[PDB]
Enzyme design. Structure first.
Site, PDB file in Angstrom:
ATOM      1  N   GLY A  18       0.758  -1.278   0.000  1.00  0.00           N
ATOM      2  CA  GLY A  18       0.000   0.000   0.000  1.00  0.00           C
ATOM      3  C   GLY A  18       0.788   1.329   0.000  1.00  0.00           C
ATOM      4  O   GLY A  18       2.025   1.333  -0.021  1.00  0.00           O
ATOM      5  N   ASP A  36      -6.213  11.125  11.558  1.00  0.00           N
ATOM      6  CA  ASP A  36      -6.592  10.385  10.358  1.00  0.00           C
ATOM      7  C   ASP A  36      -7.043   8.951  10.614  1.00  0.00           C
ATOM      8  O   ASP A  36      -6.662   8.034   9.845  1.00  0.00           O
ATOM      9  CB  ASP A  36      -5.455  10.333   9.327  1.00  0.00           C
ATOM     10  CG  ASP A  36      -5.997  10.259   7.930  1.00  0.00           C
ATOM     11  OD1 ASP A  36      -7.078  10.767   7.790  1.00  0.00           O
ATOM     12  OD2 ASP A  36      -5.383   9.759   6.994  1.00  0.00           O
TER      13      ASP A  36
HETATM   14  O1  LIG Z   1       1.358   4.335   7.339  1.00  0.00           O
HETATM   15  C1  LIG Z   1       0.729   3.628   6.501  1.00  0.00           C
HETATM   16  N1  LIG Z   1      -0.003   4.170   5.473  1.00  0.00           N
HETATM   17  C2  LIG Z   1      -0.431   3.428   4.265  1.00  0.00           C
HETATM   18  C3  LIG Z   1      -1.081   2.091   4.575  1.00  0.00           C
HETATM   19  C4  LIG Z   1      -2.481   2.276   5.126  1.00  0.00           C
HETATM   20  C5  LIG Z   1      -3.473   2.735   4.012  1.00  0.00           C
HETATM   21  N2  LIG Z   1      -3.482   1.803   2.880  1.00  0.00           N
HETATM   22  C6  LIG Z   1      -2.213   1.587   2.222  1.00  0.00           C
HETATM   23  C7  LIG Z   1      -1.136   1.238   3.287  1.00  0.00           C
HETATM   24  C8  LIG Z   1      -0.147   1.448   5.630  1.00  0.00           C
HETATM   25  N3  LIG Z   1       0.046   0.171   5.849  1.00  0.00           N
HETATM   26  C9  LIG Z   1       0.980  -0.005   6.846  1.00  0.00           C
HETATM   27  C10 LIG Z   1       1.401  -1.343   7.262  1.00  0.00           C
HETATM   28  C11 LIG Z   1       2.301  -1.560   8.299  1.00  0.00           C
HETATM   29  C12 LIG Z   1       2.633  -2.857   8.624  1.00  0.00           C
HETATM   30  N4  LIG Z   1       2.130  -3.892   7.998  1.00  0.00           N
HETATM   31  C13 LIG Z   1       1.281  -3.647   6.982  1.00  0.00           C
HETATM   32  C14 LIG Z   1       0.741  -4.809   6.318  1.00  0.00           C
HETATM   33  C15 LIG Z   1       1.595  -5.881   6.148  1.00  0.00           C
HETATM   34  C16 LIG Z   1       1.166  -7.047   5.549  1.00  0.00           C
HETATM   35  C17 LIG Z   1      -0.119  -7.128   5.071  1.00  0.00           C
HETATM   36  C18 LIG Z   1      -0.990  -6.031   5.234  1.00  0.00           C
HETATM   37  C19 LIG Z   1      -0.574  -4.864   5.860  1.00  0.00           C
HETATM   38  O2  LIG Z   1      -2.179  -6.390   4.703  1.00  0.00           O
HETATM   39  C20 LIG Z   1      -2.153  -7.854   4.554  1.00  0.00           C
HETATM   40  O3  LIG Z   1      -0.755  -8.179   4.465  1.00  0.00           O
HETATM   41  N5  LIG Z   1       0.911  -2.407   6.611  1.00  0.00           N
HETATM   42  C21 LIG Z   1       1.408   1.205   7.239  1.00  0.00           C
HETATM   43  C22 LIG Z   1       0.721   2.139   6.471  1.00  0.00           C
END
Ligand SMILES: O=C1NCC2(CCNCC2)c2[nH]c(-c3ccnc(-c4ccc5c(c4)OCO5)n3)cc21
Length: 274
Positions: free
Chosen positions: A19, A132
């Site tokens: 993302g 947010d």
């Molecule tokens: O600060 C962040 N902002 C962006 C997003 C949230 C809004 N959608 C796009 C990504 C985001 N995502 C994460 C994040 C942190 C840690 N792990 C994951 C993550 C890891 C593996 C995954 C997942 C999410 O979804 C399923 O597999 N995302 C941080 C952030």
């Protein structure tokens, strides 16, 4: 304490995305010494990027907050970058897990709200307004039954050191997230039948206290946690909601609800509105 040597000395990077923020894309990576899969957020250096890392660092021991493991300051294609390495949240987004089921109950919703409340309680007692709080920023640590729900993305966070106003935006988010949790659709209000017909009166009245159009009348986080629907969440009735069915049935414009909430939260962040 940012590490100033190359991130790729410690981490194996994937060409595989998880993302985008407003400050940064999120990528998957593996710690070179241990097995561990982690998430890497790339921010280009800037005052904002710096405050994001500062705010997330401070929040990173707290309950139901995505933990940072390491921060790097590196050059990347000749630009300064900050790289936030976070625990891997592979359970994905809150409202996606709720979809994947076919019963979701009022009690389980109060347990989820209490978890998010304890995040916001931690942040606000440390004078940090997130500003947010929304579906995409509420993630689970795994796909297992014991997964932990955590809040992420401190890109719009303000160290309330207005203050009171910025905190009241988080509290509105809590009311919006709770409304959606209880029926499957957002307040963009009312509580229409039959989806709201069996929802307890405590739930309805807490949402009412959270979605007050006037910020100064809106519930504080400490008043939220002391509300009986949150404070006595174990004893909230175990009644089947229509949330997961509605989310499945409405999945084709889930992107529009998210865009709307994103827009409402941007509008609350302006210096002068209306
Ligand atoms: O600060 C962040 N902002 C962006 C997003 C949230 C809004 N959608 C796009 C990504 C985001 N995502 C994460 C994040 C942190 C840690 N792990 C994951 C993550 C890891 C593996 C995954 C997942 C999410 O979804 C399923 O597999 N995302 C941080 C952030």
């Amino acid at each position: 304490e940012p590490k100033k040597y190359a991130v790729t000395d410690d981490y194996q990077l994937s060409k595989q995305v998880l993302g985008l923020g407003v400050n940064g894309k999120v990528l998957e990576c593996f710690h070179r010494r241990t097995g561990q899969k982690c998430a890497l957020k790339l921010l280009y250096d800037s005052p904002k990027a710096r405050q994001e890392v500062d705010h997330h660092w401070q929040a990173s021991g707290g309950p139901h907050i995505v933990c940072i493991l390491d921060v790097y300051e590196n050059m990347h294609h000749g630009k300064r970058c900050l790289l936030i390495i976070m625990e891997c949240m592979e359970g994905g987004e809150l409202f996606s897990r709720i979809q994947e089921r076919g019963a979701f109950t009022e009690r389980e919703a109060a347990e989820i709200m209490r978890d998010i409340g304890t995040a916001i309680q931690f942040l606000h007692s440390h004078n940090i307004a997130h500003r947010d709080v929304k579906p995409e920023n509420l993630l689970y640590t795994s796909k297992e039954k014991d997964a932990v729900l955590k809040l992420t993305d401190f890109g719009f966070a303000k160290e309330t050191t207005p203050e009171k106003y910025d905190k009241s935006c988080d509290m509105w988010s809590l009311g919006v997230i709770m409304y959606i949790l209880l029926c499957g659709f957002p307040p963009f209000y009312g509580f229409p039948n039959p989806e709201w017909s069996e929802v307890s009166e405590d739930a309805k009245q807490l949402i009412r206290l959270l979605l007050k159009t006037d910020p100064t009348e809106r519930l504080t986080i400490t008043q939220f946690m002391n509300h009986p629907w949150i404070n006595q969440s174990m004893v909230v009735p175990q009644t089947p909601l229509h949330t997961a069915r509605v989310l499945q049935e409405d999945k084709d414009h889930w992107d529009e609800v998210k865009e709307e909430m994103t827009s409402a939260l941007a509008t609350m962040r302006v210096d002068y509105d209306q």
